[PDB]
Amino acid sequence: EPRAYPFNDVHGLTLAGRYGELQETEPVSRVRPPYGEEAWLVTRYEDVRAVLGDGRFVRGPSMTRDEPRTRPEMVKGGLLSMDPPEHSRLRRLVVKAFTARRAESLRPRAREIAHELVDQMAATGQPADLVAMFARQLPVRVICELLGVPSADHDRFTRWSGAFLSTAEVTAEEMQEAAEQAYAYMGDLIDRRRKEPTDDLVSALVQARDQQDSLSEQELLDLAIGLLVAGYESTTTQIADFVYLLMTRPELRRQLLDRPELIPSAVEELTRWVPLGVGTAFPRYAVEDVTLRGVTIRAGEPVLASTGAANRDQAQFPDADRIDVDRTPNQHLGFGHGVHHCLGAPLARVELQVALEVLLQRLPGIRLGIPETQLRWSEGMLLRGPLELPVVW
Numbered sequence: 001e002p003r004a005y006p007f008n009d010v011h012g013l014t015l016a017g018r019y020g021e022l023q024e025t026e027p028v029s030r031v032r033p034p035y036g037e038e039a040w041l042v043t044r045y046e047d048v049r050a051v052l053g054d055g056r057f058v059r060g061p062s063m064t065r066d067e068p069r070t071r072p073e074m075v076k077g078g079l080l081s082m083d084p085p086e087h088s089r090l091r092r093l094v095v096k097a098f099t100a101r102r103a104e105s106l107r108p109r110a111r112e113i114a115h116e117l118v119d120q121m122a123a124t125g126q127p128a129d130l131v132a133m134f135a136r137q138l139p140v141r142v143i144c145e146l147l148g149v150p151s152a153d154h155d156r157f158t159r160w161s162g163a164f165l166s167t168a169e170v171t172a173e174e175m176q177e178a179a180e181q182a183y184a185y186m187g188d189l190i191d192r193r194r195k196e197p198t199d200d201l202v203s204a205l206v207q208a209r210d211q212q213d214s215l216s217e218q219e220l221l222d223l224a225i226g227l228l229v230a231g232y233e234s235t236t237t238q239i240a241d242f243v244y245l246l247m248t249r250p251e252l253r254r255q256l257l258d259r260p261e262l263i264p265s266a267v268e269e270l271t272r273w274v275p276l277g278v279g280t281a282f283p284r285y286a287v288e289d290v291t292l293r294g295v296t297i298r299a300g301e302p303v304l305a306s307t308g309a310a311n312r313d314q315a316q317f318p319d320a321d322r323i324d325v326d327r328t329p330n331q332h333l334g335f336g337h338g339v340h341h342c343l344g345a346p347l348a349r350v351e352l353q354v355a356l357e358v359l360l361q362r363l364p365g366i367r368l369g370i371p372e373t374q375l376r377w378s379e380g381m382l383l384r385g386p387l388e389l390p391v392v393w
């Protein structure tokens with residue numbers, strides 16, 4: 001009686017119909033994922049928001065439970081693995097360094113980088129893979145700027161990061177090697193900035209105080225790396241998906257060309273609309289019994305709260321399936337909700353606005369280089385997006 005989950009076809013960005021159906025008739029329902037525990041699946045915008053924001057649903061048991069998931073091999077730890085108060089402490093310190101202003105200050109470099117990337121892509125000739133040449137390039141490089149990795153080092157570092165993508169074609173031996181390398185490198189860099197502070201995120205992380213309390217050498221390392229993993233795959237896949245949408249929907253492209261100042265609010269709207277995850281990601285566990293739409297979730301059970309479904313809930317967004325770049329209000333859960341809500345959001349927004357702005361300015365007539373139906377989609381199973389987006393212009 002639990003439904004096989006996930007419901008989404010990875011071959012595209014379609015939101016499965018099961019979701020809407022369950023929002024009507026079974027808003028708290030049972031699912032069996034391909035790996036880990038059978039779980040509750042919550043699909044209404046209201047209930048998903050409730051779950052993500054309730055002190056009774058925790059992440060700490062993730063370290064010691066077989067989480068419902070679409071992959072076999074699980075990455076654990078980081079901030080997404082912690083509860084208040086331990087989480088609060090680390091999060092307080094990080095966001096003191098990692099301000100909205102710091103996010104904004106990187107806009108110019110993000111533009112330079114995107115432009116250079118479009119330069120290298122143009123140089124290969126048409127068709128050109130926008131996935132490999134731009135999408136998988138821009139966010140890791142922006143992360144390098146943010147952190148304060150010297151430019152001489154961006155290429156080597158970018159290359160180490162590629163092994164952490166769910167779509168990477170690599171051995172466990174190949175991957176440890178890259179991990180040990182990025183760790184060793186991040187550590188040295190942290191040491192250097194502590195001895196000799198600059199204006200980069202690493203320096204500000206080293207010097208962040210929250211009343212007498214500070215980040216340890218271990219917390220600083222794990223955090224720097226955590227931001228790269230949190231900030232890379234997601235933003236890459238989201239740039240890809242967004243441009244896919246741009247190239248397949250004439251009205252979407254025409255409005256952003258006519259009024260580039262709509263790009264920000266379009267980024268919001270696409271963030272709501274694109275159901276980015278194969279599944280729901282990041283199960284919450286009940287610390288005690290909880291009743292929701294009249295069903296009792298018992299203490300210790302996992303809960304999958306689908307932001308992808310939430311964001312297309314007809315009860316919260318008028319004509320939820322329509323892409324309206326002018327949507328007001330637009331309180332989507334694209335970037336999570338509650339204490340774990342994406343701490344990279346301000347930067348992510350900057351990158352997404354910049355990828356669209358620059359792509360549109362340089363290749364206003366960029367479009368698929370092959371039929372939509374021939375597109376090869378990623379079967380990495382964490383996120384949904386093209387493995388290759390060949391484009392012409």
Ligand code: HEM
Pocket residue numbers: 079080081091226227228230231232234235238276281282333334335336337339340341342343344345347348
């Ligand atoms: C388009 C790109 C991105 C998307 C769609 C995205 C989405 C999200 C979402 C939905 C969450 C909350 C998940 C949950 O509560 O289970 C989250 C958390 C997080 N994000 Fe992002 N994010 C993006 C970019 C970034 C970037 C660029 C960074 C780093 C600079 C970043 C750092 C983090 C971190 C550290 C967390 C965990 C925060 C916590 O647990 O307190 N993200 N992200």
